[PDB]
Design a protein around this ligand. Structure first.
Ligand SMILES: [Zn+2]
Length: 258
């Protein structure tokens, strides 16, 4: 049946429906900090999120997405390794059943409890659907979560999750400010990669921040109460919705910092 994260439809099966799964620039990857190359020509990231307009939160059956109005340049990413302007369309998380796993990227094989993806699309292609067909169509900002102190800016998200427990449920979610999810430093690693869920298209410039944010055990536990299934179907807890690291092959990871 349809792809997911279970024993019979999980990531090791995806290649049968999506051959790209075995492509040359698949994500995630392990970040080896000692062979990443410092690139002095990388510019600082420019995050302009002050005009962001969140609309809705949705359980799509494999994560929950917070969606933004992307019909104007209100929340944009630029700079770093990017050419041009990338509009924020949604963010989502990947997380584990235990605090020792959950991130998709790893750093010297270390796994984090969760990983936040802020997904942006290159405005020169007009809409998200065109952008995913281009090698420079998407920019995804990846932020690691470790378990520690609570993150106050995350609690608005945590409190609404009971309203979208099952697949297909959505809820109005206005006036959410993503600036509250960013770490203090914007130092990053970057490499060319793919979406980490089907259709696994190789259209992403990955920008992975060095500094994790901390969240409390109580906040991550509420992620684990969501459901893969629809209402009225047997209950399958939404945990371990992460793809394992893929071969780096002919790629260089660059770092903005030494
Ligand atoms: Zn993701």
């Amino acid at each position: 049946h349809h792809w997911g994260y279970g024993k019979h439809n999980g990531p090791e099966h995806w290649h049968k429906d999506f051959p790209i799964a075995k492509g040359e620039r698949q994500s995630p990857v392990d970040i080896d900090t000692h062979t990443a190359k410092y690139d002095p020509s990388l510019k600082p990231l420019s995050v302009s999120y002050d005009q962001a307009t969140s609309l809705r939160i949705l359980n799509n059956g494999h994560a929950f997405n917070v969606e933004f109005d992307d019909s104007q340049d209100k929340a944009v990413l630029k700079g770093g390794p990017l050419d041009g302007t990338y509009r924020l369309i949604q963010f989502h998380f990947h997380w584990g059943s235990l605090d020792g796993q959950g991130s998709e990227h790893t750093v010297d094989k270390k796994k984090y409890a969760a990983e936040l993806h802020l997904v942006h699309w290159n405005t020169k292609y007009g809409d998200f659907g065109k952008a995913v067909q281009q090698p420079d169509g998407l920019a995804v900002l990846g932020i690691f979560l470790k378990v520690g102190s609570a993150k106050p800016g995350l609690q608005k998200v945590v409190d609404v999750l009971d309203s979208i427990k099952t697949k297909g449920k959505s809820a109005d979610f206005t006036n959410f400010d993503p600036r509250g999810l960013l770490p203090e430093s914007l130092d990053y690693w970057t490499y060319p990669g793919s979406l980490t869920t089907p259709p696994l298209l190789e259209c992403v410039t990955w920008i992975v921040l060095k500094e994790p944010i901390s969240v409390s055990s109580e906040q991550v536990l509420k992620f684990r109460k969501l459901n893969f299934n629809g209402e009225g179907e047997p209950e399958e807890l939404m945990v371990d919705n992460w793809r394992p690291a893929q071969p780096l092959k002919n790629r260089q990871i660059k770092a903005s910092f030494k």
